[PDB]
């Protein structure tokens, strides 16, 4: 219960929520893509490796998204997925549409 409530708070209190780990190139790439949209004011990055309950967190993220791997990316509580998913959305215009509907980009 405690771990799920903690993850839920991160997802629900930040429009852009990224679960990451230490020295994680696709985490770094995904976060940098998001910051390139000037999203930092509404972003939260949680390093779940530096956490005693990493496995519980990962299992819950898999229950929510289908994968336990990081990065795990949510936008307004909707599942984006990993960095490859973000790259697909970015390249195909979906990421910008998402952010426009939230008022985060013009
Ligand atoms: Cs920037
Ligand atoms: Cs951009
Ligand atoms: Cs931030
Ligand atoms: Cs532990
Ligand atoms: Cs939503
Ligand atoms: Cs783009
Ligand atoms: Cs706005």
Q: Domains in the chain, start-ordered, CATH in brackets? A: 1-102 (3.40.30.10)
Closest CA to 46 of 7, 83, 15: 7
Q: Can you name the residues that pair with 18 across neighbouring β-strands?
A: 45, 73
CA of 15 to the centre of ligand 3 (A): 11
Tokens (6 digits) for 53 = 């309950």
Ligand 1 centroid distance, CA of 53 (Å): 32
3-state helix, strand, coil in the chain (%, to 5): 50, 15, 30
Calculate how far, in angstroms, residue 48's C-alpha sits from the geometric centre of ligand 4: 12
Q: What was the elucidation method?
A: X-ray
Ligand nearest to the CA of 53: 4
The answer to whether residues 21 and 46 touch, using CB atoms and an 8 Å cutoff, is: no
């Amino acid at each position: 219960e405690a771990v799920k409530k903690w993850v839920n708070k991160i997802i629900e209190e930040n429009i852009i929520a990224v679960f990451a780990k230490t020295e994680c190139p696709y985490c770094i790439k995904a976060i940098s893509i998001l910051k390139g949209y000037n999203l930092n004011s509404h972003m939260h990055v949680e390093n779940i490796e530096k956490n005693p309950d990493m496995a519980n967190i990962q299992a819950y993220l898999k229950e929510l998204t289908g994968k336990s791997s990081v990065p795990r990316i949510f936008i307004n509580k909707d599942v984006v997925g990993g960095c490859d998913d973000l790259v697909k959305e970015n390249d195909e215009g979906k990421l910008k549409e998402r952010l426009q509907k939230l008022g985060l980009v013009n």
